[PDB]
Design a protein around this ligand. Structure first.
Ligand SMILES: [Ca+2]
Ligand SMILES: [Ca+2]
Length: 322
């Protein structure tokens, strides 16, 4: 697909530190790519495997879907045995890691399994930990950072934690976050991006070489989002731009490597209150074609994946590591 709405490095989108308002951002409207269901499913957790196949899920029913981007064929290999799964991150060894929220209070955690639902492993046990995990991102060593999705605006119970490659140690990276949601590592893995949903803030965290210590005055707030509900999941491209799905806003915002907004992707029907639940953005491996999932549960509609071409090709994350 080459005739898809595309984002270019023109105007202020090509500036290192653009001074601009959201209404002035280079904007494009996403094209419908594939309807998952006529029924309302809370789509989330987009992630491609080493073979370029798309894996995603729906929070409330816990269905795990596998999609052939080429044929548009949709399969449903298995259903999560844990309540409210919210993200899927594929390991370099092929396993699917599934972050779940549980009861939203503390019964969340992370489990791993084959693409067919076999060999269920408790990476982060649910009942023994207070965590309710929404997303995660693997570093090149096999360790990973995850977001603790808890609390609300003035009750910052959330935060970000790092799990060692052997999965035996959990280390706090940054805490006192009002519902940490989205998370991403820069291409050099020295910068961690985190979205705080209930406070509408974007966090940029500069890390030391050990991957756990924050550089002096290294955790900052480069951007204050606006509108109900707030920032959700995010991913980066090979140019270190950050794509942030805005939950309840029917759009995705794109920031350059310095945390400045350079692009905006609208979901068809948002003005009328449709498809406002845009939750996750992800690139088709080896290309700059972006997929975005959203749903019309609020308006009694269905679940749909949308698409556009981003500023650059998707980044080669952990599952694509050789
Ligand atoms: Ca837990
Ligand atoms: Ca999310």
């Amino acid at each position: 697909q080459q005739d898809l709405p595309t984002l270019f490095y023109s105007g202020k989108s090509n500036s290192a530190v653009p001074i601009i308002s959201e209404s002035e951002l280079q904007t494009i409207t996403a094209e419908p790519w594939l309807e998952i269901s006529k029924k309302g499913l809370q789509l989330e957790g987009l992630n491609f495997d080493r073979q370029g196949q798309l894996f995603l899920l729906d929070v409330f029913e816990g269905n795990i879907f596998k999609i052939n981007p080429e044929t548009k064929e949709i399969k449903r290999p298995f259903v999560s045995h844990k309540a409210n799964p919210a993200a899927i991150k594929i390991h370099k060894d092929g396993r699917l890691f599934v972050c779940y929220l549980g009861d939203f209070k503390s019964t969340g955690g992370i489990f791993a399994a084959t693409e067919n639902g076999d060999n269920l492993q408790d990476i982060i046990e649910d009942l023994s930990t207070a965590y309710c995990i929404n997303d995660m991102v693997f570093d090149s060593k096999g360790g990973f950072y995850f977001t603790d999705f808890r609390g609300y605006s003035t009750n910052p119970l959330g935060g970000v934690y790092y799990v060692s490659p052997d999965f035996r140690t959990v280390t706090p990276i940054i805490q006192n976050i009002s519902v940490a949601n989205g998370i991403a590592l820069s291409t050099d893995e020295k910068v961690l991006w985190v979205t705080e949903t209930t406070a509408n803030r974007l966090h940029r965290i500069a890390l030391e070489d050990d991957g756990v210590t924050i550089q002096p005055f290294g955790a900052t707030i480069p951007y204050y989002f606006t509108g109900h509900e707030g920032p959700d999941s995010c991913c980066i491209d090979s140019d270190d731009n950050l794509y942030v799905a805005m939950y309840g806003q029917g759009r995705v915002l794109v920031f350059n490597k310095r945390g400045y907004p350079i692009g905006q992707i609208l979901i068809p029907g948002r003005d009328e209150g449709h498809m406002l639940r845009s939750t996750h953005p992800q690139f088709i491996p080896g290309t700059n074609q972006l997929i975005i999932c959203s749903n019309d549960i609020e308006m009694g509609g269905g679940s749909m994946l949308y698409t556009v071409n981003g500023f650059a090709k998707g980044h080669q994350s952990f599952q694509f590591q050789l």
